[PDB]
């Protein structure tokens, strides 16, 4: 058997954690606490469970994966 | 179910995040997971849908208990 | 997604999106207030095992004076310091939010009374 189009297509439900990355900040309250995370060291979003699309920033963001599977 | 986590277990909060609804403020769960409600309600409601009704005794002829389709027509 | 799959990551932006639907809700605020105080314990937590700002409980902080401003009511000033006062580290933040009761909310009978209660708590009688 052949299907067409050839193209895959995903699946119809998207389990939260991919839905969390497509938001950005607008309300103040937002704006102080964005602010806040990326003058320190802590990030937005988990690693492991948002994924992100298909050097050395790679290689210590590899490390810190690591780190939060451990 | 409502609110057991591993946290609870676990100790690392003093109080845990309430929800203000809980489930025996609801109708509660439809399934059971150890060891009704709507059965109550279709015999309820299919009990008020019943020949026998207040003043049934003061009716003084019977209605009849079947009818051909004919007649009813 | 916090007490089970232990992302605050993502317990963050579930509660941030919560408030544009719902910016009125004052039971959205205290829960998202209690949760980042959760946050700081864990942190705490992490390092007694093996930064600065957030381990001071500043974060939690920013949902404090914001809330206050959208919701302008003495009750649920009062509630904030509630879940602070639950809380034994970041004592400074139950004195910041203590102090803040009588200088901005005056004029209501509310405030004067929880003055009064926090002063009450043969010889001993």
């Given at each position: 058997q052949l299907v067409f189009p050839l193209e895959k297509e995903e699946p119809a439900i998207a389990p939260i954690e991919h839905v969390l990355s497509g938001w950005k900040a607008r309300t103040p309250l937002e704006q102080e606490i964005f602010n806040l995370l990326h003058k320190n060291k802590q990030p937005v979003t988990d690693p492991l469970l948002t994924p992100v699309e298909k050097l050395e920033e790679a290689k210590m963001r590899r490390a810190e994966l690591q780190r939060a599977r451990a | 179910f409502l609110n057991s986590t591993k946290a609870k277990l676990l100790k690392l909060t003093s109080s845990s995040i309430d929800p203000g609804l809980s489930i025996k403020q609801l109708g509660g769960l439809y399934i059971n997971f150890n060891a009704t409600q709507i059965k109550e309600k279709k015999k309820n409601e299919l009990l008020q849908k019943a020949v026998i009704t207040p003043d049934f005794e003061k009716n003084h002829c019977v209605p009849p208990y079947s009818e051909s389709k004919y007649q009813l027509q | 997604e916090m007490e089970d799959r232990l992302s605050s990551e993502s317990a963050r932006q579930l509660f941030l999106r919560a408030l544009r639907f719902h910016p009125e809700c004052p039971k959205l605020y205290k829960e998202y207030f209690r949760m980042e105080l959760m946050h700081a314990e864990k942190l705490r937590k992490e390092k007694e095992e093996f930064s600065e700002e957030i381990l001071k409980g500043e974060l939690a902080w920013i949902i404090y004076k914001n809330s206050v401003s959208i919701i302008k009511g003495a009750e649920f000033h009062v509630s904030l310091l509630s879940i602070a006062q639950?809380?034994?580290?970041?004592?400074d933040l139950q004195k910041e939010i203590y102090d803040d009761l009588q200088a901005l909310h005056t004029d209501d009978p509310l405030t004067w009374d929880y003055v009064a209660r926090r002063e009450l708590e043969q010889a001993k009688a």
């Open positions: - | - | 639950l809380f034994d580290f970041a004592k």
